[PDB]
Structures are given as C-alpha cells and as structure tokens.
Design a protein around this nucleic acid. Structure first.
Lengths: 176, 143, 113, 53, 141, 70, 67, 58
RNA sequence: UUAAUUGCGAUAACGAACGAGACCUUAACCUACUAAAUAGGGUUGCUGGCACUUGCCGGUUGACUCUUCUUAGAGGGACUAUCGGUUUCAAGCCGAUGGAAGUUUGAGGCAAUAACAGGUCUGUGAUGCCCUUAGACGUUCUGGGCCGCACGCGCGCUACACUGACGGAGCCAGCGAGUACAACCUUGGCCGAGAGGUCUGGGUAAUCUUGUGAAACUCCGUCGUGCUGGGGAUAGAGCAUUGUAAUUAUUGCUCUUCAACGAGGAAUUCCUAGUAAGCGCAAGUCAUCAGCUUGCGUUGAUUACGUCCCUGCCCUUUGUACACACC
C-alpha cells in the first residue's frame, strides 16, 4: 500500500497463475484439477479439488502442512492466514483435466495407444456427456510426424457457447 | 443595459485596447523587444515590430478575465503552434516564455492582474474597470 | 471561393449568376461518348449515347479541371478563371476547355458510325 | 570473491527480466507484469484477459 | 415560475444544451449574442432556424447555449439543432399544437437534419492497413 | 525575372491615366498588362481606395475584387 | 439479402399449425403470442419468428399454401 | 486495460494483431452513519470475486 | 433466389449433425424508471464588477433542491414494419411512407472435415538424439563491430509551392497513460532569445498534471508566378540534457552553409460513405532516442450501385498411358 486499483487487480491474477503452475508439478502423482482461492478477512481459503484426497492431505497433516509453509516463503505470509484444504471432484467424465493424468500414466507405464482412447471415450458417455474428442500426436510408430483421432457424439466448434461448455486439457509426455 | 466584454467581437476587442495603451505608454517594456523570435519554432521575427507587445498584453488580459486563473506555461502552449523539423512530421511545442512572463509581471504594477490562491493569476477590481471602459468604447465605435 | 466566383458574374453585365452556371452545364456535356469495345483485341470505339446524369457529372468536372490548370503558378487565382469558364460556355465562344474537351469527343463517335 | 564482477545494470534491456525463465526480448512491462509476449497468450484467461472484440 | 425546458441537439461528439426562458428575446451563444458564432462564413447557417419561421416567435422566448465537444464547424450543427428544438419544446407545452405542427412541416422542406439526429459515428481502424478499409501496399517481386 | 516590377516615376503617371472606368479591377487584373508585378500592384490598388475613385466588393487577402464608383 | 433461415421456418410452421387461433394480421399482437408458448433464449431469434408467422397471415386471406 | 500482441512465437507468415483486455466495474456507496454500524456491514455481505475496502475518513 | 448446400420447388429418396446463419463484444435511440459536491445544471444567499429600473458577467464546492447533458445499471426499440409494384403472382428483389436505426442496421470476435514434409530447436528447466563437456562453442570483465561504401529492389517520410509559404489575431477533440521503496506523470512561481535550470506542490488517478484549450482549419496583413521569401539536404562553431561512457555528429537548440526537384517513362498498389485522402494526438518498445506499428477524434469528396474482357477461385459435363498426381 498505497497502490492503485488497476495494478493490484492484475497482480492478483499473476499471484494465482504462479500457484496453479507449481501445484501442477507438486500434485502430479496424487491427482490435481486446479485451485480455487477465496480471500476472506484475515484468513484465505485455498480449496484444492483432487481425486486422491487423503494422499493430498498426507498422514494426518504432512503434505499440506509442508505446502502451507512453502506458500508463506514465496508470497510473504504468516502462520494462520493460509489454510490448504482438500475436497473431492464433481465427477471425472465432465472434468476433462482428470483424463489427461490417467492418459499420461498409461503412456508412461506402457499401454496400448489406440485402446487407451477407446476406453476413455466410453467413460465420457458413461458419466453423462454429449460428445468427445481425443487427439494424440507425435511419432506413433516409425520415425515420422503422425496424428490420431477418436471422436464421438456432437462436438460444437464455434460461437460464444464454447468457453462455458467445452473443458480442454493439454499435457505433454516424452517418451524415449 | 448589459455592457459586457462578450458583445464586442474578440478580434476587434484588441484593436481598441492596443491604441489605448500606446497613448499612455505606461504598460512598461522589458528589454527583449525586437531581439526576439516569438516562439521556439518560427523562422521570421515579428512583422509588426513597433506596437506588437501592446497587442500581446491586451490578448493576455482578456483571457485572464474570462477564466479563473491563467499561468505562464499554459499561455506559451496556447500561443505556440506548428514547426518544420527538417524532413519529418510537423510537431507542436511551446512559445517564448520570457515574453509572456513579463506581460504578467508588468501588468501587476500597472493595475490589472492579481495574485490568486492555489496557482495562477486572477483579476483585480481596477482591472475590470479598464476592460469595460474599452469594451464600452468599442460599443460606441460599432453603434 | 465559390462565393467569389458568383460576385464576378454579378458585376459582369448584371444578370443572375446561376443562369450563367446552368447554361455552362448544358454547353459542356457530350452528346456521344464511345465505349472501348473489344471484338478480337484491337481498340475499336463503338458509338454509344450519353444520358442523363453522365452529361451533368462530366460537365461539372471538366470546368474545374480547366479552372485549376489555368491557376497553376499564376496570379489569376481559381475564382477569376472559374468565372471566365462559365461565361465562355454560356456565351458559346469555342475557346474555353469546357467546350473544347466536350466538342473533341463529338466527333469521335461519328467516325465509327 | 574477485573485485570487478558486475556493471551498472539498473537500466536498459539487460537488467530487466521476466518471471518465468528470463528472456531479454519481447518483454511486457505494462501494469508491472514482466511476462514475455509468447507466454502471455498461454496465460491470458487465468489472469483475467479475454478476446471480446 | 418561468417556463423552462432543457432542449439539446447533437452532431457527432459536439453537444449543446439550450436552456429556454420567458422574457425579452436572448439567443446567446457562450455569453455572446447570435451574431458572433466564430467560424464567420457559417454565421448564415445559424440564422436558418430563425429566418424560416420568423423573428416574431423569439420575441417571448429567451435561449442561451453552452457548446462543448467536436471541432469548429461540427459545433454549429449542435447549436442549430438545439435552437430548432428550443422552439418546439416551448410551442408543444404552453402553446397550441397547430403552431408547433407548422414548425415541423416547415423544417421538412428545408431538412438539413434540424430536429432529426444524424446517423454517422466513427468506425474502428482494424489491423493491417492505414485505415479501416485501406490496406498496406503489397509486393511479390 | 520577367520585368515590370522595378519602381519608375514614368509608370506612376500612366497608373492614374488608366485607373478610372473599368469593370474588373484587382491584383489578378493589373498583372495581365505587365504592370507592377505581384505585391506592388496591391500597394498601387491601396492608393486607389483612399480618395474614392474605385470602390470595393470583396475584402479578403488574395481575393480583392473592386468595381468603378458610379 | 434478407433470406430467412430454416430454424425460423421450423417454428413458423409448428406454431401456426396448432395455434391457428391467437393469430390475427398485425405484428405487435402476434409478437406477444410467440414468447407466450415457446421458450426462446434470445430477443433477436424470438422476434424473427413473429416476422414470418405474420407474413403467412397476409397470404392466408388470399388462398391456402402447401405444407 | 489493453495489451495488443502479435500472435506468433517467432514472427513469420502474415501479420495479425489481438486486443486482450481486462474490464473493471467501479462503485461507491457513501454512508453518513455511526462508527460501529460499519463494523457490522463489513463482516457480512462479502461474496468472493469482489474487492471490499472502506476509508472511514470523509 | 441468397452474401452463403441461404431458402423455395422438382423427387428413391426420408428425416438428421457439423460449418455458415444464431451466439458474444462495441457504436447509435430513450426529457420513462434507478442514481451522483470525483458528473454537470437551476433556485437562490454571501459577494466582485458592470450598464444604472426589472437586468448582464460572474467568484465560492456558503445553503436548499434536482437529472436535459454525463457516467451505468435494468429494460424496451426492429420485425424489411405498412403500403405500392414485381415474381409457378411461390422463396425473394425493387419504389415510397413512418423511423434515431432498413448493406446481415455499421464493425469485429469465435471459426468444420481434410491437408502442406509452410514457419519456430534464436520464447522457453516444451524437447529426441548428435555435438560441446575447463588450454571451454558453458563463462565472465574490457575496447570494437552489427551502422563499413563505386552499385541494385522493398515498404516509408518530406517536397516539387500561391487551394500556397511567412506574420500576428481568433481558438475547438477523443482514445489513452502515470511513483512510496521508489525516482513516474509533473501544473503554479522565478532564471533563460532557446533547449533546459531550479524552488514548490498535487496525484495510487471520472478528484492533480488535464478542459491532456493538439493540429489541420478560421480571418486580416507580408510575398507574388524568378529553383524564388518554395524546399530543406550536405556542412562548421558553440550552448543545453540523459548517462561509468555520446569521438563512429545519442537527443534537442542558436546563427551561418544554402543544393536536389517546374507534377514523374514502361509498369503498378489500395479503395464503394463518416469510408478515401489531408491532419495531428496518445499508447507500445523506453536511462536517452519515430521518418515505425497498434489505437483515437477533427476536415470530409469525385465514382459504380454492373460484369465475366483481363488475373485467379467453385461446381457440372467431357478426355488420361498421370496417383510422391503436369515442376
């Protein structure tokens, strides 16, 4: 303080942008959709929606207890003002970020390229969806640039009804 | 009636004011007269030569009447205009500061301008008299 | 400038100046203007007729071309030249280029008829 | 340890830097962002910028 | 007590507000009377609302205007649209309709906007070109 | 330089001879006769407006039309 | 180039077929009966149904139409 | 709050421009009320995604 | 027919999806709602001057009250409306009238399947493997170059003046932007022929810069058709400023130096209305540097309102010894 209102509103967005990037790295193994911050008076509620909830918390306050101390040293805060909770996800089929982590595992483990997509496309319809699309890229067998596609149902590509409905998720893998 | 400055045209107002000052010759002269460019960008000096300052000092006085409080830097920006800066687009930069400042310093002692609060220069009581007398004189010239 | 052109005509033999302006529009509008027809490749010019806004729109343009070219490096600034062009067209003298540029196209149509 | 190991780097392009990696070209310094123009398109809607028109 | 209706005209950003009253017959523009304006050749345009219907109408009505926005010539339209409405607002409220209807149909024959607000606003300059429609010069040599 | 700009007293005699009784009188008109070229014609015309002689129509710089006093 | 679309004519046939009552000539009264029954999201698309339905009423007094 | 930017991560092909922008609605509600009544209204009536702030000095 | 596989109608075709249209953002209209001393107006007071009758110009955020402009919630307004012609008298198109609005009402935003071995390893702790792995192609400091000059093409700026240049006088916009741990925008007052020195502020920003009284323009004078007072390039000396540093003139200023070019050859690019073309302003990069790009508002035309002749794009019908497909 005393800072202008235009500068702090942009600085609020980058503060979150950093936090979302690190939790992508740190909660790669335990599952991770995103983060939802709510700055109330004094304290701040940081709700992490994840698949494996008890592993994100750890052994009765170990993972989150260490992670709360990390956020203090990054952005300059005291013990009490931050509280990292762990809640469940509202279904996997609609939340398209969850499928990318399961697909990332299946390629790293050593599972089929095409039949991984045939499994997940059914799961999207089983939850309760209109359509789906899974584009895998890179040199899928033999040394040349190639691509695949395993679509289903209705998929709308234009207009304003796009940002709200379609959940997207890009996630790169190696391998050798 | 309603004798005000606005009934008299703005261009015709200064002609009666200029001749009024040259009869007395008591508005004072600084020293930089006809050793002058007039602005920061202006190839030829003043064509009027004699008189000249009395045209300038009159137009400064009437603008101080209409508005609350006028300063030195704003008057330079108002009088100043275009340039010819080589083979580039024509820019705008302020006029001569030393001419417009000594108008305001000299008119204080003659009895027109007053020192105002906050910042700038407002009008005296006796300053409004000479403005209206010349306005009334210009009203007689037309009518 | 257009006010100064009309002040010249009021002085010259009294007269309403729009009567000279309207008569100038009549006497600088071509009757026949040829369109360039192909018919193989060469530029043969077939005789096509002209009406009605094309007679008015060309005539007003040709006056201003003759007016401005006359006052290109000249003391006789646009208003004096434009006033003379309308008098010459109204009183058909065969001197002003409003008439000559119209007359020289007459003329071209009849050769290919 | 050694005496001379710096230059007056309080201005210009060399001293200024982005938050992510540290590129000295295509640097957005408007509103104190300090994120280069390649990564800004990636992180536009997360900060709150949108293509309305 | 006195009849006051706040009429306003508009051409582009140039806006003007004509506060009419009952009295002697003032038609002032920024303090000065009607005969200044200050474009000088376009003094004749500002009379057009007056000279069509007549000076007899303004013997009761007292108008005064403050003009801001636009440029020099655009502000003349703002004054002319304001004075044109200034009569109609007075003649609609506190006078018989047949006088006010004669104003309407008089201004239709000499319709240079007057009562009607003009349609044209500026349009955005889009990328790649020196203007909206005008594009940059190409080369494939 | 195409001559007729230099000040001569012999010409000043013939200016007053050819002053009265003409339709067109201006800076545009006098230069066509090869009289005082350019600005000195404006000064010559400024003399003829003082003591009657030729009366005005337009009063602009660059557009200065005059007509004889009937 | 104001050719009305298929989705306008989808509603224009479906509305007039069932509800021939509550349809009489003018725009304003028939415009209030479009949003009555149907559930349109936008204003533009809602009012465009009222346009073509009212146009069919002008022709219905000058004989029938196919479909 | 605008930031115009070229679309490419390198600068080849055709030249195209964007207008990434941030809106900001701004309101003011001026009370002529007592001191302790402001402590009530500030605690409640907070919904996430809105910047709460009070001056308490003219 | 349409801007469009847009729709009418003809039928081994029937209904369907994606693309377009719809949707979203912005610019117009509202004297009707809901509102504000950070928006402006009226009643009036205290007061300053003025013509001397009632009235004219005001100076204060003294009081009272309000919503025409002004900002922005929340709604309506448009649907080719209503008529006239014109069509299997169908879908539409064209002439009036009402209307702020009648080209999808103006302009953008998002943008299908299928591809190109088009661009980027010089945005990257996005990256396969090859190289380089300390006498280092990692590095770190210091001088120099990316700007060398007989010569070509590409965008550009300023001119080839009198619709003009050189003087005063008059004097109006909208998009933006802006420091407290830095050195940001910076009025008012003094010093200076300039540039710029200094004392002070105010502003974390419809509150202060700021009314960003910006240009082109308006109107009287000076020159007048002579490479001229048009034009400003090359040049030399000094006075300023930003920097550890300006000599390879950083940047601006002050007198002098005063050229090239009298409307541009074949060719050739962009463009249907608040557009074209004059005109400046702001931002972007920025210790200091716009002849650049992206945005804004003033000044505001001539000329179509059609066509496949030219240059290329979409379908159908024909022919193929081609299928990494006429390179």
């Amino acid at each position: 303080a005393i800072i202008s209102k235009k500068r702090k509103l942009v600085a609020d967005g980058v503060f979150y942008a950093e936090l979302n990037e690190f939790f992508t790295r740190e909660l790669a193994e335990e599952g991770y959709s995103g983060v939802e911050v709510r700055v109330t008076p004094t304290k701040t509620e940081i709700i992490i929606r994840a698949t494996k909830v008890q592993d994100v918390v750890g052994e009765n306050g170990r993972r989150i207890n260490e992670l709360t101390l990390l956020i203090e040293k990054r952005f300059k805060y005291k013990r009490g003002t931050i509280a990292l909770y762990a809640e469940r996800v509202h279904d996997r089929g609609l939340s398209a970020v969850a499928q990318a982590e399961s697909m990332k595992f299946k390629l790293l483990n050593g599972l089929a390229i095409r039949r991984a997509a045939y499994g997940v496309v059914r799961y999207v319809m089983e939850s309760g969806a209109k359509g789906c699309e899974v584009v895998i890229s890179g040199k899928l067998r033999a040394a040349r640039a190639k691509s695949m596609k395993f679509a289903d149902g209705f998929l709308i590509h234009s207009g304003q009804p796009v940002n709200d409905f379609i959940e997207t998720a890009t996630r790169h893998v190696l391998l050798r | 009636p309603g004798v005000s400055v606005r009934d008299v045209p703005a261009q015709d107002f200064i002609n009666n004011y200029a001749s009024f000052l040259q009869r007395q010759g008591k508005l004072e002269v600084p020293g930089y007269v006809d050793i002058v460019k007039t602005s920061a960008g202006n190839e030829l000096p003043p064509q009027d030569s004699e008189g000249w300052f009395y045209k300038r000092a009159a137009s400064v006085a009437r603008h101080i009447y209409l508005r609350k409080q006028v300063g030195v830097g704003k008057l330079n920006k108002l009088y100043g205009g275009a340039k010819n800066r080589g083979v580039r687009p024509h820019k705008h930069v302020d006029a001569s500061g030393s001419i417009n400042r000594k108008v305001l310093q000299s008119l204080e002692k003659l009895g027109v301008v007053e020192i105002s609060p906050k910042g700038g220069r407002r009008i005296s009581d006796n300053g409004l008299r000479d403005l209206d007398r010349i306005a009334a004189a210009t009203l007689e010239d037309e009518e | 400038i257009v006010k100064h052109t009309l002040e010249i005509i009021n002085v010259l033999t009294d007269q309403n100046p729009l009567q000279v302006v309207v008569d100038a529009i009549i006497n600088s509008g071509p009757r026949e203007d040829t369109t360039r027809v192909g018919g193989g490749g060469a530029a043969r010019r077939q005789a096509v007729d002209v009406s009605p806004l094309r007679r008015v729109n060309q005539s007003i343009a040709l006056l201003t071309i003759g007016a401005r070219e006359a006052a290109f490096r000249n003391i006789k600034t646009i208003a004096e030249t434009l006033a003379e062009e309308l008098i010459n067209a109204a009183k058909g003298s065969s001197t002003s280029y409003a008439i000559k540029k119209k007359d020289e196209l007459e003329r071209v149509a009849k050769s290919n008829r | 340890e050694n005496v001379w190991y710096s230059h007056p780097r309080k201005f210009g392009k060399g001293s200024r830097q982005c938050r992510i990696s540290g590129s000295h070209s295509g640097l957005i310094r408007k509103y104190g962002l300090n994120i280069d123009r390649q990564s800004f398109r990636e992180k536009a809607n997360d900060i709150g910028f949108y293509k309305y028109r | 007590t006195v009849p006051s209706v706040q009429t306003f005209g508009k051409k582009k950003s140039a806006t003007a507000v004509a506060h009419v009253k009952a009295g002697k017959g003032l038609i002032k523009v920024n303090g000065s009377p009607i005969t200044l304006v200050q474009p000088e050749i376009l003094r004749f345009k500002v009379y057009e609302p007056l000279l069509l219907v007549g000076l007899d109408k303004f013997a009761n009505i007292d108008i005064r205007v403050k003009v801001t926005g636009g440029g020099h010539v655009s502000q003349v339209y703002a004054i002319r649209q304001a004075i044109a409405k200034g009569l109609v607002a007075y003649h609609q409220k506190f006078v018989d309709e047949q006088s006010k209807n004669e104003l309407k149909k008089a201004f239709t024959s000499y319709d240079r906007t007057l009562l009607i607000a003009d349609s044209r606003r500026p349009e955005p300059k889009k990328f790649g070109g020196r203007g909206a429609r005008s594009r940059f010069q190409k080369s494939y040599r | 330089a195409k001559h007729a700009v230099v000040l001569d007293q012999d010409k000043f005699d013939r200016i007053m001879k050819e002053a009265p009784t003409y339709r067109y009188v201006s800076v545009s008109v006098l230069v066509d006769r090869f009289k005082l070229g350019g600005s000195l014609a404006r000064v010559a015309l400024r003399h003829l407006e003082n003591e009657g002689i030729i009366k005005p129509v337009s009063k602009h710089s660059k557009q200065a039309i005059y007509t004889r006093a009937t | 180039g104001r050719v009305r679309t298929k989705t306008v004519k989808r509603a224009s046939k479906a509305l007039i077929e069932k509800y021939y009552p509550k349809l009489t000539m003018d725009f304003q009264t028939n415009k209030r009966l479009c949003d009555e029954i149907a559930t349109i999201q936008s204003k533009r698309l809602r009012n465009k149904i009222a346009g073509y339905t009212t146009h069919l009423m002008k022709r219905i007094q000058k004989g029938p139409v196919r479909g | 709050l605008k930031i115009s930017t070229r679309k490419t991560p390198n600068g080849e092909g055709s030249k195209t421009w964007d207008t990434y922008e941030m809106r900001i609605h701004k309101r003011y509600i001026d009370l002529e009320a007592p001191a302790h009544i402001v402590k009530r209204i500030t605690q409640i009536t907070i919904e996430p995604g809105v910047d709460v702030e009070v001056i308490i000095a003219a």
